[PDB]
Amino acid sequence: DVYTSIHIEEYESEARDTKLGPEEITRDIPNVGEDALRNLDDRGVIRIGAEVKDGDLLVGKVTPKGVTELTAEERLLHAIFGEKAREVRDTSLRVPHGGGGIIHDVKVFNREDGDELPPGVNQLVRVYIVQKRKISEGD
């Protein structure tokens, strides 16, 4: 007996071409939790019906970096790890703590399907989160 509906969130995420000469979209989220990738598939995207939490981008977007861009720490790290490691930038989407809702729907467009895209973009994917709210019980 209340006048209120459910809200609908809309997130954006497109693979922007880097100035270092990109080739394809990849997923590289270092220092990430296992829970954030507990639903993520081999494609690098979270499946539908999965909740949302802080630090969970729910999307794998990272472009290649340059050579000089590296830091002195990476130079010495060579002897630490024994072998150089590819370095990229985190261009994925940022997700707030809690999220408010849950991943119930997700739209993803691919050029291979025949969908035209703007200049500088390689892919397009949006997330849909439904806000859930319930009255207060106990008082």
Residue 34's domain comprises 2-139
The pair of structure tokens assigned to 31 is 């220092």
Closest CA to 30 of 65, 51, 60, 70: 60
Residue 136: CA atoms inside 13 Å, Cβ hemisphere, count?
A: 2
The experimental method, as deposited, was NMR
Residues 126 and 10: beta-carbon distance below 8 Å: yes
Q: 82: domain CATH number?
A: 2.40.50.150
Q: How deeply is 72 buried, as exposed, middle or buried, from its count of CB atoms within 10 A (0-12, 13-18, 19+)?
A: exposed
- The count of domains in the chain is 1
Contacts of 48 (CB under 8 A, 6+ apart): 103, 104, 105, 106
Closest CA to 18 of 63, 68, 60, 62: 63
How many Å apart are CA 48 and CA 41, to the nearest integer? 11
Instruction: Write b or e for each residue in 114-138: b if 16 or more Cβ atoms lie within 10 A of its Cβ, otherwise e.
Output: eeeeeeeebbbbbbbbeeeeeeeee
